[PDB]
């Protein structure tokens, strides 16, 4: 169950980021929205900056250091 929820959450955050990129990059000339940086078509686990790049600093700080700092 946790695996299913994790997959669904990661996919949702990636789609939200993709839609916002589509909005933001509308006037960049050589941009291609949602372009991979890898030659392979294999699925690659996203970074932390992929998921929390456009979000607020509080939840970035949580996702980065919450477990380390929780004592």
């Amino acid at each position: 169950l946790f695996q299913a929820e994790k997959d669904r959450r990661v996919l949702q955050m990636l789609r939200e980021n993709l839609e916002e990129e589509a909005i933001i990059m509308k006037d960049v000339p050589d941009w291609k929205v949602g372009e991979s940086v890898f030659h392979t078509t294999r699925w690659v686990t996203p970074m932390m900056g992929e998921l929390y790049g456009l979000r607020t600093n509080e939840e970035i700080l949580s996702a980065t250091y919450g477990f380390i700092w929780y004592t």
């Binding site: 970074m47 998921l51 790049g53 700080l61 380390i68």
Partner: protein
Amino acid sequence: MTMYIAFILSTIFVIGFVGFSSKPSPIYGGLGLIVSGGVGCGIVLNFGGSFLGLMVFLIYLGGMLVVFGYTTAMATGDWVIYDTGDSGFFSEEAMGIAALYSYGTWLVIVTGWSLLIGVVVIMEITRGN
């Protein structure tokens, strides 16, 4: 984001190295190296390296720089590269470090031999005559 706390710690690390690299009054250089070691231990701990940071802080500071001070006194962009998944119900650093006794038999043998030879070598060097 706390204004790049890792960057701040790295900058303090570099500043401490600049401090003790000028080599003023070797006790002061040792003090600067102690501060730099503390900052680097903080960097490793904040990164997630609890055991290795504590090894820095215990072995390096409490033994090695302590012996350095003894001998001296005798004389005259972050947060993005991180992972996504979890570790399970264990800490991966601990499992990898503990694999020293099952996977790294050769490393244990060579390290123990080197340490025994180092004891013998210190004895022979300091014998004098």
